Amino acid sequence: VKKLINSQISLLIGKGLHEFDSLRDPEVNDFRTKMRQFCEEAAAHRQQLGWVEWLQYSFPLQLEPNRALLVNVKFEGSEESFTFQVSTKDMPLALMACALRKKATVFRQQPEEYALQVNGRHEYLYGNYPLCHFQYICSCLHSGLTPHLTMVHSSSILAMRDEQSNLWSLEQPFSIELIEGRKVNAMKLVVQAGLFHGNEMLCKTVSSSEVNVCSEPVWKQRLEFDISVCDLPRMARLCFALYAVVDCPIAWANLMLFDYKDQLKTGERCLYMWPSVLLNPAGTVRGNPNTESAAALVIYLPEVAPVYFPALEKILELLREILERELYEHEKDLVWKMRHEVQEHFPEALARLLLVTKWNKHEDVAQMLYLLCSWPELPVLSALELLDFSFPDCYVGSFAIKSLRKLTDDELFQYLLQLVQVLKYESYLDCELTKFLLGRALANRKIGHFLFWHLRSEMHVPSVALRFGLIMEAYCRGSTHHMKVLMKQGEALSKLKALNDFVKVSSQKTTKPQTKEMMHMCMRQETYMEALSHLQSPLDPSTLLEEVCVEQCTFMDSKMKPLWIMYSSEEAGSAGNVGIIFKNGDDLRQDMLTLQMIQLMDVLWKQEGLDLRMTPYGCLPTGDRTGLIEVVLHSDTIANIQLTAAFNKDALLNWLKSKNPGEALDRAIEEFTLSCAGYCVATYVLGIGDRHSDNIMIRESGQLFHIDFGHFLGNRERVPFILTYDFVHVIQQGKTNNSEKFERFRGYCERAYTILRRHGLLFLHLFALMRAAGLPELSCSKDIQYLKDSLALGKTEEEALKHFRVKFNEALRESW
Numbered sequence: 001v002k003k004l005i006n007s008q009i010s011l012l013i014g015k016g017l018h019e020f021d022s023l024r025d026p027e028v029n030d031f032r033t034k035m036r037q038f039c040e041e042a043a044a045h046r047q048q049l050g051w052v053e054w055l056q057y058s059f060p061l062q063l064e065p066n067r068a069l070l071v072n073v074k075f076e077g078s079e080e081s082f083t084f085q086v087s088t089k090d091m092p093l094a095l096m097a098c099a100l101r102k103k104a105t106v107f108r109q110q111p112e113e114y115a116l117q118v119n120g121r122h123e124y125l126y127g128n129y130p131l132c133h134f135q136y137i138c139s140c141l142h143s144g145l146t147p148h149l150t151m152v153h154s155s156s157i158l159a160m161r162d163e164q165s166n167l168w169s170l171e172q173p174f175s176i177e178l179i180e181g182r183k184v185n186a187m188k189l190v191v192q193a194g195l196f197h198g199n200e201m202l203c204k205t206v207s208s209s210e211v212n213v214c215s216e217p218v219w220k221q222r223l224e225f226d227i228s229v230c231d232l233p234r235m236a237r238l239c240f241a242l243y244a245v246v247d248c249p250i251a252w253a254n255l256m257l258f259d260y261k262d263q264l265k266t267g268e269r270c271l272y273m274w275p276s277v278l279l280n281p282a283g284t285v286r287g288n289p290n291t292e293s294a295a296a297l298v299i300y301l302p303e304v305a306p307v308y309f310p311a312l313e314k315i316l317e318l319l320r321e322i323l324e325r326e327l328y329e330h331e332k333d334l335v336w337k338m339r340h341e342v343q344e345h346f347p348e349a350l351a352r353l354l355l356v357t358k359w360n361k362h363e364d365v366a367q368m369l370y371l372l373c374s375w376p377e378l379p380v381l382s383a384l385e386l387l388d389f390s391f392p393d394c395y396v397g398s399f400a401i402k403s404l405r406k407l408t409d410d411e412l413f414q415y416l417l418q419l420v421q422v423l424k425y426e427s428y429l430d431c432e433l434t435k436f437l438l439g440r441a442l443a444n445r446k447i448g449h450f451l452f453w454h455l456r457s458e459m460h461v462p463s464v465a466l467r468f469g470l471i472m473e474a475y476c477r478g479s480t481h482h483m484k485v486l487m488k489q490g491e492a493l494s495k496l497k498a499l500n501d502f503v504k505v506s507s508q509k510t511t512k513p514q515t516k517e518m519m520h521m522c523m524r525q526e527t528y529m530e531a532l533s534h535l536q537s538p539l540d541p542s543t544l545l546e547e548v549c550v551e552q553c554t555f556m557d558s559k560m561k562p563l564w565i566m567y568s569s570e571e572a573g574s575a576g577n578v579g580i581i582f583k584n585g586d587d588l589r590q591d592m593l594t595l596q597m598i599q600l601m602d603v604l605w606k607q608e609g610l611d612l613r614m615t616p617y618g619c620l621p622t623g624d625r626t627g628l629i630e631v632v633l634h635s636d637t638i639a640n641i642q643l644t645a646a647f648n649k650d651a652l653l654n655w656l657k658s659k660n661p662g663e664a665l666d667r668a669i670e671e672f673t674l675s676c677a678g679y680c681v682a683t684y685v686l687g688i689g690d691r692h693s694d695n696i697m698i699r700e701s702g703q704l705f706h707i708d709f710g711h712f713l714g715n716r717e718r719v720p721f722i723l724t725y726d727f728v729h730v731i732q733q734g735k736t737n738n739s740e741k742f743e744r745f746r747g748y749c750e751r752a753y754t755i756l757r758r759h760g761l762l763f764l765h766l767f768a769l770m771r772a773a774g775l776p777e778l779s780c781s782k783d784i785q786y787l788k789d790s791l792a793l794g795k796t797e798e799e800a801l802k803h804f805r806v807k808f809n810e811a812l813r814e815s816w
């Protein structure tokens with residue numbers, strides 16, 4: 001019935017829907033019914049889209065940021081195929097026209113009723129684009145391969161659509177009553193309490209009287225805060241810390257003083273606390289769900305009267321440049337004084353102005369909000385800064401989203417990971433960000449795919465399980481069919497975990513050959529063959545993983561026995577020969593961020609016409625210390641290649657010569673040189689140390705790349721720029737001296753470095769939002785500072801390039 005759907009979502013999301021119901025929370029009840037309708041009406045809209053708009057939803061085009069080629073085309077019904085020669089500048093229509101036209105000759109006898117499917121992939125070619133804007137066509141040209149496509153008629157596409165259908169009054173100083181608690185420690189117990197608006201204190205942090213450290217922490221005190229109740233802003237957050245002293249932190253807990261209906265809360269409360277690492281303003285505002293084990297604090301919120309935060313209508317009723325290029329009190333005063341100027345003449349300095357406004361004075365907040373309601377839209381870069389925890393106000397949050405609505409699907413995808421982490425900072429379940437993500441996800445299946453996995457991957461974290469579960473359920477209501485596709489992915493991943501556990505056990509008792517044989521036998525079981533085959537890759541939904549082909553599957557020798565799983569697809573040909581690595585026991589989150597950043601650098605470079613031949617391979621956490629990495633085929637580790645050469649320095653170049661005979665070598669050396677420049681710069685900027693020959697790989701094309709990003713951000717040394725002699729040797733064509741090739745290489749590096757600096761704030765804004773994620777190596781200011789320093793953002797370009805040159809020369813000396 002709908003019974004089945006409910007049980008399908010419960011399995012898919014990793015939480016039973018009955019668990020939601022058992023909280024008997026209207027916030028949650030309302031979140032669920034609110035969004036379910038929102039998601040259900042989005043499904044509505046889509047089931048009536050035109051066939052090209054459906055393609056846009058389900059198969060978003062994959063593009064790049066004159067000359068001729070051979071393309072093979074067939075039609076959906078037959079085996080017969082035709083090979084033409086087309087231009088890289090041609091449109092898909094022209095290609096479809098030739099295809100149609102021929103079929104007519106051989107078929108004894110209108111392009112616009114067709115789209116071209118990439119054989120064996122969930123990828124289509126359509127739209128007004130040259131064939132070498134399409135990533136698959138591009139891929140084939142740089143690799144040499146022949147594009148194989150299938151003419152799909154509009155009515156076949158519509159068959160797919162149809163088969164996937166579903167107040168100011170209160171001047172008294174704010175106060176609470178700290179009643180008692182129930183905890184464990186060695187001393188006397190103190191409760192410190194403090195009121196926050198983002199990172200900023202709304203007043204001084206009143207503390208408890210000292211009470212012995214045994215059993216319950218009875219207090220029955222009245223805590224009064226240095227602030228009027230009418231001055232508490234909408235997003236006011238009360239923050240506790242319980243600790244011992246003769247310092248020993250024990251626990252923390254936060255809550256919103258206003259509930260999700262704008263009512264000021266009153267009065268009693270049991271706060272189930274989170275274990276501590278001293279106040280944690282950024283911490284979640286929801287209680288610890290381990291209500292058996294957690295220490296708890298009972299408090300009382302006094303009745304001040306029913307009081308709601310005023311509606312917007314009431315709210316609305318109530319040397320500049322030289323500092324505007326982190327400032328003093330008099331500077332702040334100037335900026336606040338100048339707010340109208342700021343809006344009219346420096347609209348992009350909104351963030352600055354927001355941080356100087358007095359959130360602990362309601363009158364000031366009102367005047368700021370009135371400016372905000374007429375404020376011009378901001379660039380996306382500026383909106384990314386506003387998503388920071390430092391901007392907690394809901395109107396600000398809403399303004400930020402409003403400026404982000406113009407994000408292209410491509411941009412949104414590039415920033416999605418960060419936007420999901422920002423949900424952790426949200427105060428309430430129903431929020432503009434969640435609505436925006438769910439809307440965009442329901443309009444673009446790729447976005448929906450990566451949103452799903454970002455959420456699913458953290459369900460084992462109790463602070464986000466509820467929020468993320470709820471979002472995934474909403475999403476599933478909005479696409480029943482995608483829900484089935486994702487279940488199939490879940491079933492594969494479930495089987496891989498079991499397979500990997502077995503491998504961990506077996507390798508402890510037997511040789512690797514024996515274990516591998518057992519792995520193979522396990523995989524050939526009907527249940528495994530079936531679970532592991534015929535699915536969309538979680539790494540990239542457009543890649544279909546068809547028949548898992550064992551004999552080629554193995555596992556690595558390293559601790560948590562990462563699995564190496566290979567696939568083939570008759571229908572896709574060579575493009576269907578794809579591999580994934582399943583890893584369980586390692587935290588994949590830091591490879592994802594890093595690989596993501598590298599992707600963004602590649603994109604920023606390509607946007608200036610600089611293609612450094614980078615390899616931004618897929619990486620996707622799917623669960624608790626679980627996830628996938630995309631295999632880059634026809635590549636091996638530097639270590640491995642340093643394995644016939646008389647001198648070890650030549651092993652690399654000999655290998656390249658062997659894979660690139662004759663005049664092919666010069667292209668490979670160029671690919672090596674550009675990619676080396678890319679990764680030299682990327683690893684310097686990102687502070688990725690511990691680079692060695694086991695975690696640097698090369699492709700047979702010549703392109704160098706990095707794997708195993710365990711320790712970025714100098715993490716803390718200050719990782720120098722690195723040039724390896726073996727790499728300089730290849731760049732210089734195996735010559736001792738070749739300053740023509742070398743100083744070109746030095747040019748590539750400098751160009752790459754200077755382009756990144758120009759987008760320095762993009763990197764800082766993105767890393768700022770990633771502080772939400774609790775990555776151990778992105779936890780504080782010192783980590784953000786690393787980026788500031790590596791991009792030398794405090795300098796003029798010039799100064800920065802001179803600085804960079806010292807470092808480059810530094811690195812060169814180091815490489816004998």
Ligand SMILES: O=C(O)c1cccc(Cn2cc(-c3cccc4c3N=C(N3CCOCC3)CC4=O)nn2)c1
Pocket residue numbers: 554555556557564581617629630631632633635697707708709
């Ligand atoms: O010794 C073996 O039995 C063995 C079995 C299968 C493969 C290998 C060689 N190997 C190991 C790895 C490897 C080891 C540890 C970490 C990683 C990794 N490869 C990775 N990739 C990613 C992109 O595609 C190339 C492989 C990523 C990665 O993080 N890559 N290749 C060795």
